Design a protein around this ligand. Structure first.
Ligand code: HEM
Ligand code: HEM
Ligand SMILES: CCc1cc(CNC)cc(OCc2ccc3ccc(N)nc3c2)c1
Ligand SMILES: CCc1cc(CNC)cc(OCc2ccc3ccc(N)nc3c2)c1
Ligand SMILES: C[C@H](O)[C@H](O)[C@H]1CNc2nc(N)[nH]c(=O)c2N1
Ligand SMILES: C[C@H](O)[C@H](O)[C@H]1CNc2nc(N)[nH]c(=O)c2N1
Ligand SMILES: [Zn+2]
Lengths: 416, 409
């Protein structure tokens, strides 16, 4: 690799130099002969060995004391030694509260696919490593939801449960997000609610959940503690902020009966810190409008409302080149933004978000020597080229600590 | 190893074997992806193997791989490189190579058309007057009174590098751009530099919003020369809107024929520094990028004003609304004037079908998601949800430096 990699913005001519890539840790999937930049997941029940864990821990510890300007200090060398003794006698080790907080914040700072990272340092970290039961997990998650929601003034947060040990005692949240709507396949092949969540719903129903079988039913939490069978809990409905979707100009838009929930809370990723694995680490921010307005609502295999909206807009839907789809899409996204703002629930539009991300990325290049970014994900799902990120060259690479994908728990769980 | 790509909307999974045949680098490494970098990073000795590879895949394409004809061709090519340090492509080879440069263009969403390409062989050309003749004929043929036909014109190959043929225009047809005293730009800001060179070389500029630039043509490494395309060969479309009657009062128009003239065609180790090619427009090329890029004609604000939209807050999505209307106008204008054009829904749709074709008949299809996905309405087109492998096959179209940066007068 070269020491200096340069990226250009083609709209502003601004050029930035990246050195942070030298710190890259794992593989991207690309080679010199092929690029897998548009593959969603470019790639066993066993855990890190002693010898594998030593250098990963030391790497993170080094980076931590380096961040607080105490590199090579007595406390640094002592912490190294303590960590080394712990690994050597227990095959694992425990993070200090400060190290945990630093690690969580940096996994977010390092998330190449996140357009919201200007916020990374303002993450509230809830330490749930004392948790031992699913009831306890439920307590922590509820407290998380209430804090994060803040009566609509959303605050970003992460709750972190005990790290993996032997891989047979994992903590998992089986939900893909803390709050999602149920999806139900009908005998006639149609889907009620959210087609994205049909499989998870069927699992909940199997596990005992009695479904309301409506259009927007909040799923229960399915929580696994210490590798035991997962348990169902209903989130107190008052903890679940929702926004009915209406439109500034089209009075009929409310008649569509759409709503969405305020808190986006991904709960199925793995947080890796210093070689330690936190398989349950629900985190939440707030929405960019297109997440709801374009993807959740207008994806074909989601709520797929474009046609019904375009019909009420009395658009000519017979030719594609009338751009009836594009026209309808804009009005839906206007509605989503308008309804959140009206209800004073935090949300950010794709223009503001991408403009803040360019400012963030620049600052990162200046103060950090780079900012990994996944263009394929950073560019919004509509209006791409009228946002500043479209024209921005980016380098993608993996820094640690990081959020990682992990397989769905029902696929691996040994049922007791 | 065999690689799979998945469409997350349809769950269709295709298997790539074709990438195994690439040899050119993409710019990525195992540790760092550069998929969003616009431009990443001969001798007798080097030339023959490149030639061999091309001849090999040519005779393979006509199911005569290892034939007496094939062997004699290799030998003929070896002898020729020996006695001349280069070689000449057969007419068949030229046409094959040009179609496959298009076929291999990872960033082109229009490649379902790849084998319908009219190839004009201009390798006998010697002077800029000759290039001008060939280019007028190309333009006339490709334009076809609005029923556009894909075409490429191939001028003589690079020899010593001191004698290149170059079309200095980035496209055969483009509008001039002018740096104004007050500081602003009249016409196309993308072409301000090129416009200045034409003016400096003697072109008398109308100084309008849509002045068609002259051809600036360089033959055999000599100073480039100026030519006016006969106006009757330049097909243009006034942009109007099917609902907004005031839209025509914006005085917008564009040309029908998109004809990229600054790329380099490489075939079997040979480099064709002048190879203007044309097809037809996808509406967003004009309606989104040409018209609404901040650094281009930049008309979003004017349109939104006429639509009387609230422009005080960005969350009103006034930009997004205006953008769709401009693109409705562009498609509607071309279609009313019967000038070939494709919308991004239909084009991306075709491209998915084309991928399936290619995976089936060829074992893959190199594709650059960053370029294939349209500059608006990404996820409501099928390509958004389509995983793509990008890799570099040859024959190819490559970037090359602008010749004023290189030329000695
Ligand atoms: C605070 C406001 C935030 C905004 C506006 C935001 C925005 C986004 C958006 C729009 C995406 C793409 C979503 C998609 O297309 O599915 C994303 C991805 C992501 N974000 Fe953020 N985010 C925020 C907070 C956070 C926080 C607090 C974390 C972690 C602590 C985080 C970590 C991630 C990760 C790991 C991804 C990629 C996940 C994947 O690859 O599937 N984000 N973000
Ligand atoms: C026939 C109808 C065609 C359509 C609808 C079409 C469409 C497109 C579009 C929309 C782009 C992106 C351009 C941009 O964003 O600036 C593109 C790129 C490209 N096309 Fe096609 N195209 C067509 C024909 C052709 C032909 C005839 C050739 C060559 C023989 C060709 C070769 C290329 C190449 C090399 C690029 C990428 C240029 C670069 O990397 O900068 N295309 N095409
Ligand atoms: C593969 C698992 C997956 C798929 C998808 C598909 N997106 C439509 C999204 C995934 O995560 C998406 C994500 C992650 C973190 C976020 C934080 C804040 C926010 N507003 N949105 C987020 C959205 C994960
Ligand atoms: C990187 C150099 C470059 C930049 C840009 C900027 N796009 C707005 C476009 C470039 O080529 C753009 C191109 C090439 C071939 C085409 C063939 C047919 C067609 N309709 N459009 C094309 C468009 C090259
Ligand atoms: C930075 C980025 O690579 C650059 O802006 C690209 C993005 N995608 C594109 N896609 C197309 N079709 N055409 C372009 O010019 C670009 N520009
Ligand atoms: C095939 C492609 O990688 C996939 O559809 C990606 C494209 N870009 C995306 N970008 C974001 N922000 N979110 C997504 O889910 C996706 N999906
Ligand atoms: Zn790559």
């Amino acid at each position: 690799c070269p020491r200096f990699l340069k990226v250009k913005n083609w709209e502003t001519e601004v050029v930035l130099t990246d050195t942070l890539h030298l710190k890259s840790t794992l593989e991207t999937g690309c080679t010199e002969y092929i690029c897998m930049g548009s593959i969603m997941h470019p790639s066993p029940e066993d855990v890190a060995t002693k010898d594998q864990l030593f250098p990963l821990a030391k790497e993170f510890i080094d980076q931590y004391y380096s961040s607080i300007k105490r590199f090579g200090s007595k406390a640094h060398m002592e912490r190294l030694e303590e960590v080394n003794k712990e690994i050597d006698t227990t095959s694992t080790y425990q993070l200090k509260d400060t190290e945990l907080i630093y690690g969580a914040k940096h996994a977010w700072r390092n998330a190449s696919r996140c357009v919201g990272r200007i916020q990374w340092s303002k993450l509230q970290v809830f330490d749930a490593r004392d948790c031992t039961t699913a009831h306890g997990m439920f307590n922590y998650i509820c407290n998380h939801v209430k804090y994060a929601t803040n009566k609509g003034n959303l605050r970003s947060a992460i709750t972190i449960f005990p790290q993996r040990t032997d891989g047979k005692h994992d903590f998992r949240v089986w939900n893909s997000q803390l709050i999602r709507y149920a999806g139900y396949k009908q005998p006639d092949g149609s889907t009620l609610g959210d087609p994205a969540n049909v499989q998870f719903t069927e699992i909940c129903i199997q596990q005992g959940w009695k479904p309301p079988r409506g259009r927007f039913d909040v799923l229960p939490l399915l929580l696994q503690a210490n590798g035991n069978d997962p348990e169902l809990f209903q989130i107190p409905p008052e903890l679940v902020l929702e926004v009915p979707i209406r439109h500034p100009k089209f009075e009929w838009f409310k008649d569509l009966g759409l709503k969405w929930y305020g808190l986006p809370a991904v709960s199925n990723m793995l947080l890796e810190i210093g070689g330690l694995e936190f398989s349950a680490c629900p985190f939440s921010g707030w929405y960019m409008g297109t997440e709801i307005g374009v993807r959740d609502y207008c994806d074909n295999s989601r709520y797929n409302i474009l046609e019904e909206v375009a019909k009420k807009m009395n658009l000519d839907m017979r030719k594609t080149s009338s751009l009836w789809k594009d026209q309808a899409l804009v009005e839906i996204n206007i509605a989503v933004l308008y309804s959140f703002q009206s209800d004073k629930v935090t949300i950010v539009d794709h223009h503001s978000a991408t403009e803040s991300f360019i400012k963030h990325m620049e600052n990162e290049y200046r103060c950090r020597g780079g900012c990994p970014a996944d263009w394929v994900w950073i560019v919004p799902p509509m209006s791409g080229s009228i946002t500043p990120v479209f024209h921005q060259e980016m380098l993608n690479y993996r820094l640690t600590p990081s959020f990682e994908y992990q397989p769905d728990p029902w696929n691996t769980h040994v049922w007791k």
